[PDB]
Enzyme design. Structure first.
Site, PDB file in Angstrom:
ATOM      1  N   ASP A  73      -7.596  39.055  25.238  1.00  0.00           N
ATOM      2  CA  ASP A  73      -6.349  39.154  26.320  1.00  0.00           C
ATOM      3  C   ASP A  73      -5.230  39.202  25.790  1.00  0.00           C
ATOM      4  O   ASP A  73      -4.190  40.309  26.044  1.00  0.00           O
ATOM      5  CB  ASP A  73      -6.358  38.026  27.254  1.00  0.00           C
ATOM      6  CG  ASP A  73      -7.510  37.883  28.110  1.00  0.00           C
ATOM      7  OD1 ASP A  73      -8.313  38.920  28.336  1.00  0.00           O
ATOM      8  OD2 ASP A  73      -7.915  36.743  28.511  1.00  0.00           O
ATOM      9  N   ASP A  89      -7.820  34.322  24.693  1.00  0.00           N
ATOM     10  CA  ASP A  89      -8.454  34.572  25.806  1.00  0.00           C
ATOM     11  C   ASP A  89      -8.437  33.512  26.703  1.00  0.00           C
ATOM     12  O   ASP A  89      -8.184  32.311  26.691  1.00  0.00           O
ATOM     13  CB  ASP A  89      -9.998  34.919  25.553  1.00  0.00           C
ATOM     14  CG  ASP A  89     -10.721  36.066  25.799  1.00  0.00           C
ATOM     15  OD1 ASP A  89      -9.752  36.907  25.994  1.00  0.00           O
ATOM     16  OD2 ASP A  89     -11.863  36.237  25.972  1.00  0.00           O
ATOM     17  N   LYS A  91      -9.594  31.648  29.941  1.00  0.00           N
ATOM     18  CA  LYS A  91     -10.921  31.335  30.696  1.00  0.00           C
ATOM     19  C   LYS A  91     -10.663  30.382  31.827  1.00  0.00           C
ATOM     20  O   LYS A  91      -9.995  29.374  31.765  1.00  0.00           O
ATOM     21  CB  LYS A  91     -12.137  30.860  29.907  1.00  0.00           C
ATOM     22  CG  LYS A  91     -12.316  31.593  28.569  1.00  0.00           C
ATOM     23  CD  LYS A  91     -13.075  32.892  29.030  1.00  0.00           C
ATOM     24  CE  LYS A  91     -13.574  33.544  27.795  1.00  0.00           C
ATOM     25  NZ  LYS A  91     -14.151  34.866  28.172  1.00  0.00           N
TER      26      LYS A  91
HETATM   27 LU   LIG Z   1      -9.219  38.228  30.322  1.00  0.00          LU
END
Ligand SMILES: [Lu+3]
Ligand SMILES: [Lu+3]
Ligand SMILES: [Lu+3]
Ligand SMILES: [Lu+3]
Ligand code: NA
Ligand code: NA
Ligand code: NA
Ligand code: NA
Lengths: 244, 244
Positions: A73, A89, A91
């Site tokens: 990300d 990232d 989550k």
């Molecule tokens: Lu993502």
DNA sequence: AAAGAT
DNA sequence: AAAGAT
DNA sequence: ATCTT
DNA sequence: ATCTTT
């Protein structure tokens, strides 16, 4: 540090702000649904300006993937340290009641982790850290008041699809488990554990190298994992015996 | 009709409003990203009040799934005729330039079409209609998206993550193609065509019977398919041979 | 197109 | 869990 | 990108 | 749920 300020800022933004709808340019508000497709997406968007503000304060550039099939990300790096990039990232998962056990799907085990340039914004060997920003929410049933549009004067009347959101920041390797998080899309599973164990980093791997070696050699199906390894004790045995 | 009122109402809502942000109870707004993960979520929430409104004008109850990997997004039915349900599913894809060809993924071929109760809110045989609401957005080339937050008086400043959006409502079978829309997740591919073909219903299947049987008997890989059929002409030839 | 990424 | 659903 | 028995 | 890559 970058890290400690990031977590403090996320923790604080989560405490102060409750996301509640999608707003139009014209001012009409569409309420949220109470599923993870909706909230994961909302929690990423929620996190983006915080991540950018804190990165900027510490002199880091932020890049998001240019194509949709790329981890992570967010890529953070100083111009001066191009081979110490930080992958983040976001989550999300849920519980039905507070203080139940949770788990996350931590991305593929067959892309960038076995092939340095596969599905990743920069080559995997230019990152020195991989962080997960983990969001956990308690699911709430959809009331009829969710089925309507709202006006800005009504913001605090909009029903929220969650209770008690909690967030953490932890290294990927540290919260990784020894069982797949998904089958046909070959994802690393996290530990299955209470929120605190994520915060405190009570994982199963002893080092980041062990994490990597475990997931670089994990077979795709039980069929195959039967004669090689299925879990961490079995992998340690396989290692002890000479990787056979 | 229910159908005609719903499409009019979706065309109108889409002309009138441009979603631009996630809003919090406290009035802070977080901008949208411009990928399909964000937008497919947003377009579904956006369609939800309109669906409920029109369904209520016609005497239909609306139910959403309780389980998160059950089709369809919306289940309509009059309470007096529970065995005549209508399934509405929302699908999103993008283009680069206006009026290139587009294709959608239209859901599994190995779930409820082959097993009456699998991954479906009600048994498949209780539905008499399967509608797709398709959203096509022109991707906006700012993949340096906006990384700040806004207040309710800066709504006009918030970059929108699409250049334009169009919407259609069509039956699933009509726009279904003969080539898988995805591999490891075994989705039906729509036709690969211009947006007006979807609105006008210019498909390949002769009937919804043909569409179902095609996707019910499609094999999962090329090697398996090569002995049976890989496209609609080979399916018709397979039919002529005796389903073998 | 098919297979495998997110 | 594993395997295959969204 | 995560969920389901 | 959908994308990108063979
Ligand atoms: Lu993502
Ligand atoms: Lu949906
Ligand atoms: Lu949905
Ligand atoms: Lu859907
Ligand atoms: Na909050
Ligand atoms: Na994967
Ligand atoms: Na619009
Ligand atoms: Na499927």
């Amino acid at each position: 540090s970058l890290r400690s300020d990031l977590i403090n800022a996320l923790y604080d933004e989560n405490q102060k702000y409750d996301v509640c709808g999608i707003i139009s340019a014209e001012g009409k508000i569409y309420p949220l649904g109470s599923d993870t497709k909706v909230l994961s997406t909302i929690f990423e968007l929620f996190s983006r300006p915080i991540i950018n503000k804190i990165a900027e304060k510490h002199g880091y550039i932020v890049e998001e993937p240019k194509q949709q099939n790329h981890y992570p990300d967010f890529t953070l790096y100083k111009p001066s340290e191009p081979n110490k990039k930080i992958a983040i990232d976001i989550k999300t998962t849920y519980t039905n009641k507070e203080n139940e056990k949770i788990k996350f799907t931590l991305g593929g085990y067959t892309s960038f982790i076995r092939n340095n340039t596969k599905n990743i914004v920069y080559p995997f060997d230019q990152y020195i850290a991989h962080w997960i920003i983990g969001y956990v929410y308690t699911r709430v049933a959809t009331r009829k008041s969710s089925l309507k549009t709202y006006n800005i004067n009504e913001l605090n009347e909009i029903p929220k699809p969650y209770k008690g959101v909690k967030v953490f920041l932890q290294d990927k390797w540290v919260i990784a488990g020894d069982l797949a998080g998904s089958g046909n899309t070959t994802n690393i599973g996290s530990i299955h554990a209470h929120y605190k164990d994520f915060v405190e980093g009570k994982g199963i791997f002893d080092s980041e190298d062990e994490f990597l070696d475990y997931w670089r050699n994990y077979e795709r199906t039980s069929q195959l994992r039967n004669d090689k390894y299925n879990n961490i004790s079995e992998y340690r045995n396989w290692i002890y015996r000479g990787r056979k």
